[PDB]
Amino acid sequence: MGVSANLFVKQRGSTTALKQPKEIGFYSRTKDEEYLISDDTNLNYYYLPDAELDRKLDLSSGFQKFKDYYKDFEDRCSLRGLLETIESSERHKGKKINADIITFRGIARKLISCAFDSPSFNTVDLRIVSFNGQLFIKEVPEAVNGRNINQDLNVFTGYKFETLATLSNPLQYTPREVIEKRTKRIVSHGDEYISVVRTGVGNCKLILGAEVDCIFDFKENGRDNLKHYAELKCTQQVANISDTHKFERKLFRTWLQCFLVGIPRIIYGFKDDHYVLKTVEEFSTEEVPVLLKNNNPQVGSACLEAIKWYGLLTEWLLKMIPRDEDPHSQIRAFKLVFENNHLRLSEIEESDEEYSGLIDGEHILSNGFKEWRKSLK
């Protein structure tokens, strides 16, 4: 009886713009999975002078003492801090946020890039959905419980560059010894600052949680800081014409990541073989579509195709008939989403399934205190 539907991944819509991103709030996540709503202890500040690029800074240094906390988390992809942040913005104004879909920027990017990247290259994942009066979308974790250590070292390299280029407090409030210790400092992952952004495409209104690296120039208290953030990005050599094309495909995915949530600056480090930081370069998020149209037309073309697909995708998430029954005490429904063989597939999770009793009755998708917030109107 219930919903089953498929969307063809190379079909595209008509939307070519996003509603201007605005910051609802923020939270920081501790290494202990505690969520600190309206708290910014994990927001870093950028600092890396041009003179530092003359020094042969090594991005492999300290790999053996890496604190990867994120592996040990009980619910790696949990919505809890996003929902708990939304509730705090609703409590002081007495009404729901008018939005249709609540999700992470990472899930929005993983969807949109299906239009271009095949399931293996994309690293396709299960996505899982429910309604309450709006759609809530969650990623299913990787199930893990250029090869082996040489892939883990290329992952670590990104977290070390983000640790070398930043400070935990403003430069003006940081003592000189903390700047000198910075090359010896332990690198860690799963200790984020997450901004909560309101946005939209066509007629769809969206709330995206977005993990941000640092603030580039300055912080304004009690205001949208969205124009002050930057993304610092993972690093590679460029020494030949075909290296420019390998870079341009990474720069497109990086523009897509910033554009969805209004981050205006992208900063790239570059490496030799081995792990010496060779150079740094910086891009405004507005340059990238023009820069790609000039240097590589068939990649620069994808910037419009991505948004024409993002609108089609989000309209068909609402038009593939999940119930949007508004009364927050009416019975819920619950669905899978996949990408498989140029189709995206969606199916209800009927009450016989092991998931169905737990996403409907229990903690696995929406927090009990959030269900009480909204059922108390």
Partner: peptide
């Protein structure tokens, strides 16, 4: 093709 992605003004609520 001169068209490129841009933002639009929100609903003001």
């Amino acid at each position: 093709d001169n068209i490129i992605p841009t933002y639009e003004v929100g609903d003001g609520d």
